[PDB]
Amino acid sequence: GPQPISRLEQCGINANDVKKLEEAGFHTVEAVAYAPKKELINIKGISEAKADKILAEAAKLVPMGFTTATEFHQRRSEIIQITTGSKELDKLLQGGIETGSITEMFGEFRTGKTQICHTLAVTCQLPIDRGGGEGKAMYIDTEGTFRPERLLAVAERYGLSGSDVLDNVAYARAFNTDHQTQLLYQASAMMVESRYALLIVDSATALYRTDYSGRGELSARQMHLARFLRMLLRLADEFGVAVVITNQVVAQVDGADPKKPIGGNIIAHASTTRLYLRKGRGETRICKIYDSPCLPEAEAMFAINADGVGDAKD
Amino acid sequence: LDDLSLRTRLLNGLAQQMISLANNHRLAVILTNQMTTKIDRNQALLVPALGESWGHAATIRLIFHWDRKQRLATLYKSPSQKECTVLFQIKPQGFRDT
Amino acid sequence: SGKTQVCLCMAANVAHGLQQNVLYVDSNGGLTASRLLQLLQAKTQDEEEQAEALRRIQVVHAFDIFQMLDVLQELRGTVAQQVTGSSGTVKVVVVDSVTAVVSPLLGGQQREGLALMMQLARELKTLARDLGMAVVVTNHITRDRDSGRLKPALGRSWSFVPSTRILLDTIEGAGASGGRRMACLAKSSRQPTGFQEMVDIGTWG
Amino acid sequence: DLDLLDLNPRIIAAIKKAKLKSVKEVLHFSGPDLKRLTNLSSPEVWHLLRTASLHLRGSSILTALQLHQQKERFPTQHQRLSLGCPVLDALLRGGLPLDGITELAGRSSAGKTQLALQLCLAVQFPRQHGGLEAGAVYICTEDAFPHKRLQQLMAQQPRLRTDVPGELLQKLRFGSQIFIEHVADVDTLLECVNKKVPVLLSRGMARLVVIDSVAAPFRCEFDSQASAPRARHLQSLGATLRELSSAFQSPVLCINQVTEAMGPLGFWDERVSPALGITWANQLLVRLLADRLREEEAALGCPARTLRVLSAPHLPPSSCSYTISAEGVRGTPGTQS
DNA sequence: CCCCCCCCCCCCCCCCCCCCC
Ligand SMILES: Nc1ncnc2c1ncn2[C@@H]1O[C@H](COP(=O)(O)OP(=O)(O)OP(=O)(O)O)[C@@H](O)[C@H]1O
Ligand SMILES: Nc1ncnc2c1ncn2[C@@H]1O[C@H](COP(=O)(O)OP(=O)(O)OP(=O)(O)O)[C@@H](O)[C@H]1O
Ligand SMILES: Nc1ncnc2c1ncn2[C@@H]1O[C@H](COP(=O)(O)OP(=O)(O)OP(=O)(O)O)[C@@H](O)[C@H]1O
Ligand SMILES: [Ca+2]
Ligand SMILES: [Mg+2]
Ligand SMILES: [Mg+2]
Ligand SMILES: [Mg+2]
């Protein structure tokens, strides 16, 4: 059961300190054992030595190893957000692409997912003060639509060197789902030796549409997809990289031409942030927040220029 | 409870004790069971839990289920009446009919 | 399956058609007087005749093995003392379920349950043979795990006890919505084994 | 503990020879088992069962009138945990029960995590304001904990809870009373529930458990050909959670995923149904369902969200409507059905 | 050597022009 703060008297703490802590509301040794040092310091008449000695005395009476919310928040203040090359998208996402989580973007054809992937693969190598992540990029491609010339164009736009940018990108091609999982294993083995800041799968659901074809193979398809997404989550958690995947759409025939992403509930639950891309006018596109745990739903406009993804011109 | 023989022995003893109590004290004993899934011929059917030998324990067995949106009560087993099926519903006042 | 229904029909027919005493031993609460009255109402319409037939059936409740053994021994002693009399002697004895009182004693690595059930079998055999009576008992059905074949419960030791066995079954679900039951001769000593017939519980009432 | 009883010396010697330790040990076995072990006879074995059963409890008579009248002696029957919104509390007739698992299931973006965070914040309020004056435990299974949204909610709390005076709000240490745990496997989740949760509950540092997505590991580790081990694990987890909740009088909130219906379970005209099957459904007390209609918000412009009561021993099947904003989850007045 | 038992999984997929004062 809980132990009253009066137990601190036997440990060698003055009764005045115990009375002051009781005035502060700390009625249990467990409550004061997890209080932050700054909170104790802000109490009048308590110095750094006094707070340290109180914490040391209370530490050996209360079990440790549980993380509170304040510790979790103060340990995550170093999180990095990578710029997307567009000011409007950065404002919409409030900083850019978050590291350590899974971001998914879906839409019909021509909406501009591969272009965003290329722009991110280039901009992930910028210094942190310029909006980058200062690391390498990894590209897993399941369609054969990887073009280094777009990377060269973006690198020239940002004033970098094309040779180094091309040297700092690892590329692999997947021919079926089993090869996709094996490539993920190889990537997990590879990420230890060097430092990586991004991982791109494009696309994550193209091969599942045809490898498991029919009504009678739905369950195995969803099972395999769930295993793949779990492996992606483990990689992102362990190495603190940003995972970006793309998805396709299907038409709603049961009841303005509406469309929904494929993959069912598995990919919807696995993903953290979801972005909806649709065609605008000319070279301009529209991005909409489809689902996010901390962002209200809104819209923004960007464009696909000759040097990657950027703001709409006029 | 991984030792199923012990479970069956305990269940049989409990059933015998309950029927003895009901007969000796002129009571009515009501027991509620759960439903499980039986997988055969790639088809799933709902059956009462605790095995087949538990079906002999009770004297009268009733089964409740949904058909489409109504609730049905089926007299699955009885030594004095005949198998039937009726309709009931739950109101703010409790167990009712229609 | 309909074991209790068959026993009730037999008891009613013997009590009314032949006018002889019947003793009913119940171990699971499956005996009801309303069903007996309903069965009797389909054979006669005289109220006094029905009451006289009902007065010839004795009901005994036994819920554990020791009570059943005591009841059987008391019946043996009563019949032994009642040799001279002829109007009142019990001719048919029905044990509603021998499995309900032996199942709790079976299990583990012990051997007391086997001895007790063998003692019960010896009591039943003595009652049947020595006193020239008719003894009918009911048993549960089990499926073999290694072979998937339906067999009587209580084990191989119990498999040797009865001199005649009848197996009841439902007719594949369809065509057996009620009353329609499947009868068979699992064991006998005067007929080949395997012959099948047809019964209808609904028409008996 | 077997020597606290009143038995003949021969019986005590026999049961000691059988390596029987406690009353639970002797009540675990059956009559024939004790007959084979102690080498006794039926009457004294029956008397031993008498004594053990009386030792576990007895001589206390409890009636429904006492439960209905003595409110302080039975807080389980009369005390509820508020959800932070008057409309949702009116829908739930006070709030969550203090004994039993409560499920919350729905499709993606329905708003389950927001409700979990709101409950974790509201559990810290005084008794007269719907709280239990204690912290909470949060277990994450699928994603990382959303600390930014929690910070925003803690900052906005004085503007949501209008009834509570500001002076009492100022002294509340919201972030210091919430504990966060991470789990990556079924076995890890079972070990966490078995070991870390009871330690936190016994010391009184928390009076609420949020397992969050309980279906996440089971969807990925068990196929359709391994239903028996999955059922065994689910039964063990449910039994442990129910035992902890009953022992410490703390609610347990579980978040579940849905699957396409594609109706023995009473889900005829519904698109989706809760996952994990009937084995998990047998362990629950109150079942809720949060839903979002994307085909109606296309006309309204604003999202359409409803909270429904699927089943409860004391609540009729009804529903209401709510919205999500910077403050948190708030109910819409005059919408209960 | 002795007797009898367990339980589901999961969404897919657009079609098709009419009509002169
Ligand atoms: N050098 C370039 N300058 C301008 N626009 C370009 C250039 N290269 C490609 N684009 C634009 O890229 C668009 C296609 O976008 P993208 O390749 O990202 O499609 P996607 O969403 O991946 O499609 P899919 O579903 O078919 O895989 C074209 O409409 C084209 O206008
Ligand atoms: N600050 C905010 N203001 C308004 N709405 C917000 C805010 N943060 C999140 N939301 C809303 O939260 C919704 C998603 O809620 P939530 O993250 O609780 O979903 P969920 O039911 O837990 O889903 P999942 O299955 O993905 O875990 C989004 O639709 C978004 O509109
Ligand atoms: N009056 C009646 N009319 C028609 N059918 C009846 C009537 N009374 C009983 N039955 C039938 O009797 C059946 C049950 O038979 P019975 O009671 O003999 O079973 P049993 O084999 O003794 O079962 P148990 O193992 O549970 O003791 C019921 O399914 C019902 O259809
Ligand atoms: Ca999600
Ligand atoms: Mg593409
Ligand atoms: Mg019967
Ligand atoms: Mg969530």
Coordinates of C-alpha atoms in Angstrom, one line a residue, chain C residues 14-194:
Chain C
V14 CA -46.6 -52.4 -17.8
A15 CA -48.6 -50.7 -15.1
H16 CA -51.8 -50.5 -17.2
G17 CA -51.7 -53.2 -19.8
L18 CA -50.4 -56.0 -17.6
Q19 CA -51.4 -54.4 -14.2
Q20 CA -48.1 -55.2 -12.3
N21 CA -45.9 -53.1 -10.0
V22 CA -43.1 -51.0 -11.3
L23 CA -40.2 -49.4 -9.4
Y24 CA -38.6 -46.3 -10.9
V25 CA -35.1 -45.2 -9.8
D26 CA -34.4 -41.6 -10.8
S27 CA -30.9 -40.0 -10.6
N28 CA -31.2 -36.9 -12.8
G29 CA -34.7 -35.5 -12.2
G30 CA -36.0 -36.7 -15.6
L31 CA -39.2 -38.3 -14.3
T32 CA -42.4 -36.3 -14.4
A33 CA -45.9 -37.4 -13.4
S34 CA -47.6 -35.2 -15.9
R35 CA -45.9 -37.1 -18.8
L36 CA -47.0 -40.4 -17.3
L37 CA -50.6 -39.1 -17.0
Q38 CA -50.4 -37.9 -20.7
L39 CA -49.2 -41.3 -21.8
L40 CA -51.9 -43.1 -19.8
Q41 CA -54.6 -40.8 -21.2
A42 CA -53.9 -42.2 -24.7
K43 CA -54.7 -45.8 -23.6
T44 CA -57.8 -45.4 -21.4
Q45 CA -60.4 -42.8 -20.4
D46 CA -61.6 -44.1 -16.9
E47 CA -60.3 -41.8 -14.1
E48 CA -60.3 -44.6 -11.6
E49 CA -58.5 -46.8 -13.9
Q50 CA -55.8 -44.2 -14.5
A51 CA -55.5 -43.6 -10.7
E52 CA -55.2 -47.3 -10.1
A53 CA -52.5 -47.6 -12.8
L54 CA -50.6 -44.7 -11.3
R55 CA -50.7 -46.2 -7.8
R56 CA -48.8 -49.2 -9.1
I57 CA -45.6 -47.2 -10.0
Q58 CA -43.1 -46.5 -7.2
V59 CA -40.7 -43.5 -7.4
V60 CA -37.3 -43.5 -5.7
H61 CA -34.7 -40.7 -5.7
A62 CA -31.0 -41.5 -5.5
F63 CA -28.4 -38.9 -6.3
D64 CA -25.1 -40.7 -5.4
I65 CA -23.7 -44.2 -5.7
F66 CA -24.2 -45.1 -2.0
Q67 CA -27.9 -44.2 -2.0
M68 CA -28.5 -46.2 -5.2
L69 CA -26.7 -49.2 -3.6
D70 CA -28.7 -48.9 -0.4
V71 CA -32.0 -48.7 -2.4
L72 CA -31.1 -51.8 -4.5
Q73 CA -30.2 -53.8 -1.4
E74 CA -33.4 -52.7 0.4
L75 CA -35.4 -53.8 -2.6
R76 CA -33.6 -57.2 -2.6
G77 CA -34.4 -57.7 1.1
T78 CA -38.0 -56.6 0.6
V79 CA -38.5 -59.1 -2.3
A80 CA -36.8 -61.8 -0.3
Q81 CA -39.2 -61.2 2.6
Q82 CA -42.1 -60.9 0.2
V83 CA -41.9 -64.4 -1.5
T84 CA -45.3 -65.6 -0.3
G85 CA -47.2 -62.6 -1.6
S86 CA -48.0 -62.3 -5.3
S87 CA -50.0 -59.1 -5.5
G88 CA -47.5 -56.3 -5.0
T89 CA -44.2 -57.8 -6.0
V90 CA -42.2 -55.6 -8.3
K91 CA -41.7 -57.0 -11.8
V92 CA -39.7 -54.2 -13.6
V93 CA -37.0 -52.0 -12.3
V94 CA -35.8 -48.9 -14.2
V95 CA -32.6 -47.0 -13.3
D96 CA -32.9 -43.6 -15.1
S97 CA -29.2 -43.0 -15.5
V98 CA -26.3 -45.1 -14.1
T99 CA -23.8 -42.7 -15.7
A100 CA -24.9 -39.7 -13.6
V101 CA -23.8 -41.4 -10.4
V102 CA -20.6 -43.0 -11.7
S103 CA -19.1 -40.1 -13.7
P104 CA -17.9 -38.1 -10.6
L105 CA -16.0 -41.2 -9.3
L106 CA -14.0 -41.8 -12.6
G107 CA -10.7 -40.0 -13.3
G108 CA -7.2 -39.6 -12.1
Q109 CA -5.0 -42.6 -11.2
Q110 CA -7.4 -44.0 -8.6
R111 CA -9.4 -47.3 -8.8
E112 CA -12.3 -46.9 -6.3
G113 CA -14.7 -45.8 -9.1
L114 CA -14.2 -49.1 -11.0
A115 CA -14.8 -51.2 -7.9
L116 CA -18.0 -49.2 -7.0
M117 CA -19.4 -49.5 -10.6
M118 CA -18.6 -53.2 -10.7
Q119 CA -20.4 -53.6 -7.4
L120 CA -23.4 -51.8 -8.9
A121 CA -23.3 -54.1 -11.9
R122 CA -23.2 -57.1 -9.6
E123 CA -26.3 -55.8 -7.7
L124 CA -28.1 -55.3 -11.0
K125 CA -27.2 -58.8 -12.3
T126 CA -28.3 -60.4 -9.0
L127 CA -31.6 -58.5 -9.1
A128 CA -32.2 -59.5 -12.7
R129 CA -31.3 -63.2 -12.5
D130 CA -32.0 -64.4 -9.0
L131 CA -35.4 -62.7 -8.6
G132 CA -36.6 -63.2 -12.2
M133 CA -37.1 -59.5 -12.8
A134 CA -36.5 -57.1 -15.8
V135 CA -33.9 -54.4 -15.3
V136 CA -33.6 -51.5 -17.7
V137 CA -30.8 -48.9 -17.4
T138 CA -29.8 -45.9 -19.5
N139 CA -26.3 -44.8 -20.5
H140 CA -24.6 -41.9 -22.2
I141 CA -22.8 -41.9 -25.6
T142 CA -19.2 -40.9 -26.3
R143 CA -17.1 -40.7 -29.5
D144 CA -13.6 -42.2 -29.6
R145 CA -11.0 -39.6 -30.1
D146 CA -8.5 -41.8 -32.0
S147 CA -11.1 -43.4 -34.3
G148 CA -14.2 -41.1 -34.4
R149 CA -16.7 -43.9 -33.6
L150 CA -19.6 -43.6 -31.3
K151 CA -19.4 -46.0 -28.3
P152 CA -21.1 -46.3 -24.9
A153 CA -19.6 -44.4 -21.9
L154 CA -18.3 -45.7 -18.6
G155 CA -15.5 -47.7 -20.4
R156 CA -14.5 -51.1 -21.6
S157 CA -15.2 -52.7 -18.2
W158 CA -18.8 -51.4 -18.3
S159 CA -19.1 -52.6 -22.0
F160 CA -19.4 -56.2 -20.8
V161 CA -22.3 -55.7 -18.3
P162 CA -25.6 -55.6 -20.3
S163 CA -27.1 -58.6 -22.0
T164 CA -28.9 -56.4 -24.6
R165 CA -28.2 -52.9 -25.8
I166 CA -30.2 -50.5 -27.9
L167 CA -28.8 -47.4 -29.6
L168 CA -30.9 -44.4 -30.3
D169 CA -30.0 -41.6 -32.7
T170 CA -31.4 -38.6 -34.6
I171 CA -32.1 -39.0 -38.3
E172 CA -29.4 -36.7 -39.8
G173 CA -31.2 -33.6 -38.6
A174 CA -33.4 -33.4 -41.7
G175 CA -36.4 -35.6 -41.5
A176 CA -36.1 -35.8 -37.7
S177 CA -37.5 -32.4 -36.6
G178 CA -39.3 -34.1 -33.7
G179 CA -40.3 -37.5 -32.5
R180 CA -38.6 -39.2 -35.5
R181 CA -35.7 -41.1 -33.9
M182 CA -33.4 -43.8 -35.3
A183 CA -33.3 -47.1 -33.4
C184 CA -30.7 -49.8 -33.6
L185 CA -29.7 -53.1 -31.9
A186 CA -26.1 -52.5 -30.8
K187 CA -25.8 -55.8 -28.8
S188 CA -27.9 -58.9 -28.4
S189 CA -27.7 -62.6 -27.7
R190 CA -30.5 -64.0 -29.9
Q191 CA -30.4 -61.8 -33.0
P192 CA -27.8 -60.7 -35.5
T193 CA -26.4 -57.2 -34.7
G194 CA -27.0 -54.2 -37.0

